[PDB]
Amino acid sequence: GPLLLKDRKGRAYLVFPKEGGVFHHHKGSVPHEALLEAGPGGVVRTHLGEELSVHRPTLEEYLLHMKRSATPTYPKDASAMVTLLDLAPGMRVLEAGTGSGGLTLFLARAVGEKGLVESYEARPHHLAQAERNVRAFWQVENVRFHLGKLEEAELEEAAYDGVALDLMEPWKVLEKAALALKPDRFLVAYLPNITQVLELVRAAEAHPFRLERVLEVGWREWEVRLPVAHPRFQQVGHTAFLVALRRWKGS
Template identity: 30%
Template sequence: MTDAAYLLVHEDREYLLEPGEEFGTDLGVIDVPEDVAAGDTIETHLGTEFEVRELRGPDLFDHLERTGAPMMPRDVGLVIGHTGVKAGDRVLDAGTGTGILSAYLGRDDAEVTTYEQDPEFAEVARENMRVAGVSDQVDVRTGDLTEHVDELAEGDGFDVLTLDTANAPEIAARADELLVPGGFLAVYSPFVEATHDAADAVKEAGLTEIETLETIQREMDFSDRGSRPSTAGVGHTGYLLFARRP
């Protein structure tokens, strides 16, 4: 994996730029050298210094071009933690969207094949994978995964199947054909009804270790008066269903 872009930081300013790129700001023009590396310092033509940083996962969430609401880093963390995805694993994904999950998994050196039904979204995702430096790890395909299950099921099988798409229950129903023995399924949905349907589908498919989580977080506020959860309320993003092929 190689980094195609870097994060340039000055105080509260952050810009995602590539080697050789020229970018104008009110702090001056940033001219990124072709041989730029993390740890370098670049001065604008007005003398403002920017620190060059290697991209990390949260930077991808903050700066990649979006085609909708991407999966939150906390949800990505649950997917990685509950499936144990690792370098060399073969991952099949549906519902690429912006590609945040695929980029995270690619940066962990998993081999990801991801399907996106919208051709324009798929093209944005391919560019995002290039910017993230994971084009060699992530194959973004345009199409509906349900139309390719038969051919994919004839292969060697996938270690992990991740679904973030409206037809997830239909695909989950055939998870036993797509996964290797011991392989994991992860289904994300913002709606409980779709999650319930997916749970019914994986039970019918004979998967085990089925677990459903609502992903919520509470931010904490600290002050001289004391510590308490933020009054902003509980942050719900969605539901994650996990299951495993016996």
């Protein structure tokens, strides 16, 4: 399990500890052993008043700092997608594209060791990084990764409890998703542009799906250091829209 270090300026660093390893930093390098000794919740004092706080990274912190090729789903959105997909332990969820494994991790927590994340990724380098990212943080073998286009997947009809999409052209996978998804259950797509949203809404009218939700998730952060207290001057204003479709009654 990696560590997250924060310095006094609030800069964050993801460290994968190894014996003989050294964390380099402008106010003093620290052997990895010192980090492990301090442990999550602890500190390592260095030079000129500097102090590195040591943390077990939350899944949010991990997504935000992990290596990536494809930009991962933002934590606020991945969190909402799991709820909109109504995922509970033991469920089977279809995902494309794996990307960098950010959403994959959220999905994998939600369905747990008896559940399944069936994840597809078309690009081999993307998939390799995603697999590293997932495995470095999560040891439960409840993700089945597939190299290939979701359009071409061999899937059991009505075997999946939800379908999570994060890809540029979700209309292309709606036929496969409609086949996979249990009646009355949900597909939820993440899309940056309202034009993409409208295109998906129109495309879904050619499939057994009913539009249920189009929403924007906002996590409006405050800066509070009493007596200072105000919404942060600079916010992430937008990441993507979430589009939820419900699968038509069966047969």
